[PDB]
């Protein structure tokens, strides 16, 4: 039924074109924060805050982390079917969650923060990670198969004093998971050129903006670096969770980031939290070390605030912008599908599009014009060998809200 | 009106250091960078580097790091290509043009006239001149210019009178010196019934010479 | 590294006629802001070069509109739809894309013209360089079409590359044509061990070697 996106799928619509090809469908039916959308080998894993009140100042009520199945509900539209809940014991506790799929399970590496959001406040958080392993299929009396809790004990990270899950999902290779991280490193042990910042052309920018921008501001004690935590379940006795930093080509602050299989090779996104607005995507050349050969897009950016807004590519000392995902369905001709927020400041609009590197094919919206919205997560695969994509969209009871959408064979309706 | 006037020609030694200048005139100078452009003799343009007037800063290419500085004036409305421990492979035509930012044209519409800057460790030493006499109805006779130093040399016979059907061709080197023949065609009416003599002047080391071409014994 | 491969490097085109200069570049010149900075130069003797095109297509100002640009992404073709003389020069493309920005290798707009044979003219050392120690054969090889030349320098039968330095000029303003000169330059002994001194020429006008010789015995 629902397969992973790989080997030869099929055609889909190659041309530019203004009809109305794309038909999203509404798959899902206090308030509802920091999502997370994973979705591998026919399975689903899921995660959200559950608080009363406020989103922001609001007191947390219940972390949810579920995984189950996406199947065909009926109508030839795949949608996902819990089968395994899991809820900590204090809901304020549990912070930047990633799932990754492994044969049986769903690994999700929470890090675990008694002085909140670890990204507020870096100097204070004591570096304390958790794995929590659902069961995709859970059998009854089967001790730990359904639910496993492992607090981490050996983390092993290089020149950064801490590391953490930055990100909603990440891949396997072999026996061997890799989750979205970052790590923060002390500004007085960060050895950056200025040289390197891409000031030219840009009248009012100075060559120190790149070095002030990595970190969340301009006096940070830190600055974030993004790349993979590995986990190697080879190494059955006590697992190591090492630390693989990304490659410093464009590199930009440490941010959200997402690292997946498609058409069986691995592709890496990663959010533009900083001065570098045009989307950050591209195939993997090496895992370990991280490397990303970033896609020269020019269509797709991300709304800012005043210092960085959209399609920004001026070095700016800012922090302000969104996740918003893109996967990649066909690699022969580099097209990927995602949602973009189509405003330059404020987080708003959600379309739908599928887009080249310097062209976007088709799109749709999702919403009203005037309607809010943030972080959005996709993720593409086969029903039946015909390329879907489910995208979580946070809105404004405040909730996100799930689309299936089919990606089209012909340019035509 | 708008102008870019760059410094002078120079010669120096290996080691020594140069500093060029690109004044500009006939534009607010802040609202558009420079571009310093290399030109090796008889090749391709090189990109050196872009300055940024209003800021100061420099871009410039990984190949032009250390040893060579970027500077700008701004009261002067001045750029300035600073290299400093010159070696031979910086012997070469410098440009300066206008780049602008990203708010207009980054094109480079308007050049300097170029500052040519020629590295070697010869000395100032003048031309020998030799004739060059057969040994048809045309005649052909040559002016033969050797062991010289710097460029350029210029070349004319009967001080410019016969400019139709001569050709001067570019100097080589034999070593640290320059070398270069002038070939010089006329109807074998004119010579050597008339005295066909060639002016070769070396204005670096400030010499002239003339020599007639008479012909050989046989 | 982002390289512009230039296509042809000499471009013989008669007056009027139309030209087609390429242009490919080893990555998309497509920057991430949407603009292609792909620009077309033009560069005349002795002169700093001029803007031609700017952005693929678009023409700077002054610019006559037989020049046209065309292209994306890593292919693109300069035409000029009819060659007046004042077109006569070396075009560059350029991209202002990916630091460090790269030149192409650059095409040599030149007249064509009828082929010609060279003139070829032999002479033996003077006796000033003989008294002053050193001896030079010069051979001249004028007005002749189309450039490509060869020339071999014999003594007593014997071919000798050795102390051989060659010179070219470039077309001539009022025929169109080129000239060569080869110098062989021994010292005063071995020029007195042997007699026959030979310059022979290979170009396409004739395909029989141009000869040109001289023996010791005056
Ligand atoms: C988007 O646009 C960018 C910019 O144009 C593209 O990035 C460039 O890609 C090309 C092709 O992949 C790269 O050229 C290759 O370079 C490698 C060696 O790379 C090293 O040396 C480079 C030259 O000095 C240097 O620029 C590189 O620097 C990068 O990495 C450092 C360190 O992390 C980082 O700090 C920088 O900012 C740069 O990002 C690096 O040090 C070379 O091996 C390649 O040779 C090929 O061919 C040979 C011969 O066949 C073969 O043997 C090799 O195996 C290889 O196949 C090639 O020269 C270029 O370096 C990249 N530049 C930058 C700035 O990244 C990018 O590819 C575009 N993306 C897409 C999707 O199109
Ligand atoms: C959302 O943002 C884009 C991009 O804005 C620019 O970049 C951001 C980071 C910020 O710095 C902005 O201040 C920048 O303007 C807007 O699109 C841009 O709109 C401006 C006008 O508002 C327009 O400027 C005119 O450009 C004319 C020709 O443009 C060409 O030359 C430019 C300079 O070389 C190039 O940058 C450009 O790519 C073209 O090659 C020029 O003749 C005029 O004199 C103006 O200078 C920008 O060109 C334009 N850039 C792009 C990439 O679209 C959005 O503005 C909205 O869309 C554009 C198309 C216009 O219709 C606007 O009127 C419109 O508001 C902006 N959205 C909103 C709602 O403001
Ligand atoms: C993960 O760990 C396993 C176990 O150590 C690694 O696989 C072993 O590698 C050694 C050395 O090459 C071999 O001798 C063993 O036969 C391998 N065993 C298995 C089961 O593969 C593996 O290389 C590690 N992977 C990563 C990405 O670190
Ligand atoms: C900063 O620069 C130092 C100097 O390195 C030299 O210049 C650079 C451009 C390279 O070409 C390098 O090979 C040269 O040795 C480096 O030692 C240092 O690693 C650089 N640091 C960073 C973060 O780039
Ligand atoms: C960070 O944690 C410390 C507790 O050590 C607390 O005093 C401080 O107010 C916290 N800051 C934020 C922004 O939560
Ligand atoms: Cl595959
Ligand atoms: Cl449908
Ligand atoms: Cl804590
Ligand atoms: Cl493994
Ligand atoms: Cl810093
Ligand atoms: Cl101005
Ligand atoms: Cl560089
Ligand atoms: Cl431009
Ligand atoms: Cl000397
Ligand atoms: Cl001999
Ligand atoms: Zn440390």
């Not at chain 1, 989103?55 to 996406?70: N, S």
């Not at chain 1, 049986?104 to 870096?122: E, K, M, Q, W």
């Not at chain 3, 006796?127 to 003594?155: H, M, R």
């Amino acid at each position: 039924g629902v397969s992973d996106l790989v080997g030869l799928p099929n055609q889909i619509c190659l041309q530019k074109t203004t009809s109305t090809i794309l038909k999203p469908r509404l798959i899902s039916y206090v308030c509802i924060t920091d999502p997370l959308l994973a979705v591998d080998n026919g399975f689903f894993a899921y995660s959200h805050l559950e608080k009363i009140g406020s989103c922001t100042r609001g007191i947390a009520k219940q972390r949810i982390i579920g995984v189950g199945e996406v199947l065909d509900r009926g109508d030839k539209v795949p949608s996902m079917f819990m089968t395994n809940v899991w809820t900590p014991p204090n809901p304020s506790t549990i912070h930047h969650c990633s799932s990754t799929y492994h044969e049986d399970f769903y690994y999700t590496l929470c890090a675990v923060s008694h002085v909140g959001d670890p990204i507020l406040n870096s100097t204070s958080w004591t570096e304390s990670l958790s794995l929590i392993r659902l069961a995709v299929r859970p059998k009854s009396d089967s001790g730990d198969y359904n639910q496993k809790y492992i607090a981490i004990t050996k983390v092993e990270r290089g020149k950064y004093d801490k590391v953490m899950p930055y990100g909603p999902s990440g891949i396997k290779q072999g026996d061997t998971l890799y989750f979205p991280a970052v790590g923060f490193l002390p500004r007085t042990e960060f050895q950056y050129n200025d040289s390197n910042c891409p000031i030219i052309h840009c009248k009012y920018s100075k060559a120190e903006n790149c070095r002030l921008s990595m970190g969340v501001n301009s006096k940070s004690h830190y600055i974030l670096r993004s790349g993979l935590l590995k986990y190697n379940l080879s190494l059955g006795g006590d697992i190591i969770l090492q630390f693989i930093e990304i490659a410093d080509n464009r590199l930009t602050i440490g941010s959200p980031s997402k690292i997946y299989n498609s058409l069986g090779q691995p592709v890496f996104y990663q959010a533009s939290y900083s001065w570098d607005t045009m989307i950050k995507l591209g195939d993997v050349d090496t895992v370990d070390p991280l490397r990303v050969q970033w896609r020269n897009n020019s269509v797709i950016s991300r709304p800012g605030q005043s210092q960085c807004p959209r399609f920004n590519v001026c070095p700016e000392v800012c922090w302000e912008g969104t996740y918003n995902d893109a996967f990649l369905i066909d690699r022969l001709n580099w097209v990927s599908a995602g949602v973009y927020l189509n405003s330059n400041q404020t987080a708003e609009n959600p379309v739908f599009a599928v887009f080249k590197d310097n062209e976007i094919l088709y799109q749709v919206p999702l919403a009203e014009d005037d309607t809010n919205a943030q972080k959005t997560i996709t993720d593409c695969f086969l029903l039946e060998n015909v390329i879907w994509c489910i995208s979580l969209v946070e809105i404004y009871v405040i909730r996100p809200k799930l689309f299936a959408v089919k990606i089209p064979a012909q340019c035509s309706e | 009106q708008i102008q870019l006037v760059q410094s002078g020609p120079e010669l120096k030694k290996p080691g020594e250091t140069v500093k060029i200048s690109c004044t500009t005139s006939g534009y607010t100078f802040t609202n558009y960078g420079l571009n310093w452009v290399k030109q090796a003799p008889g090749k391709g343009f090189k990109w050196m580097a872009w300055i940024n007037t209003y800021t100061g800063e420099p871009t410039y290419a990984d190949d032009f790091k250390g040893r060579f500085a970027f500077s700008l004036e701004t009261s002067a409305s001045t750029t300035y290509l600073q290299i400093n421990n010159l070696k031979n492979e910086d012997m070469s035509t410098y440009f300066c043009a206008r780049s602008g930012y990203y708010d207009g044209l980054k094109a480079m519409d308007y050049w300097g006239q170029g500052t040519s800057v020629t590295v070697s460790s010869a000395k100032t030493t003048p031309p020998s001149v030799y004739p060059l006499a057969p040994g048809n109805s045309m005649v052909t006779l040559g002016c033969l210019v050797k062991g010289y130093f710097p460029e350029p040399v210029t070349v004319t016979w009967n001080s410019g009178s016969l400019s139709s059907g001569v050709h001067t061709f570019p100097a080589v080197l034999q070593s640290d010196l320059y070398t270069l023949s002038s070939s010089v065609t006329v109807p074998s009416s004119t010579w050597p019934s008339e005295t066909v003599t060639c002016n070769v002047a070396h204005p670096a080391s400030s010499t002239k010479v003339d020599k007639k071409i008479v012909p050989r014994d046989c | 590294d982002v390289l512009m491969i230039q296509t042809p490097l000499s471009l013989p085109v008669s007056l009027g006629d139309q030209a087609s200069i390429s242009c490919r570049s080893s990555q998309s010149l497509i920057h991430i802001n949407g603009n292609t900075y792909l620009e077309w130069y033009l560069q005349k003797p002795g002169q700093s070069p001029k803007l031609l095109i700017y952005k693929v297509s678009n023409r700077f100002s002054g610019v006559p509109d037989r020049f046209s640009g065309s292209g994306s992404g890593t292919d693109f073709t300069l035409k000029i739809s009819r060659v007046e003389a004042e077109d006569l020069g070396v075009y560059y493309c350029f991209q202002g894309s990916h630091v460090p920005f790269t030149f192409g290798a650059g095409t040599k707009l030149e007249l064509k013209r009828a082929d010609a044979a060279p003139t070829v003219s032999i002479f033996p050392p003077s006796s000033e360089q003989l008294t002053s120690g050193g001896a030079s054969v010069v051979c001249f090889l004028n007005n002749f079409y189309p450039k490509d030349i060869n020339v071999k320098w014999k003594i007593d039968g014997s071919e000798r590359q050795n102390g051989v330095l060659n010179s070219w000029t470039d077309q001539d303003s009022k025929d169109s044509t080129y000239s060569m000169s080869s110098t062989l330059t021994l010292t005063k002994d071995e020029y007195e061990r042997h007699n026959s001194y030979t310059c022979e020429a290979t170009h396409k006008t004739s395909t029989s070697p141009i000869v040109k010789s001289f023996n010791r015995n005056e």
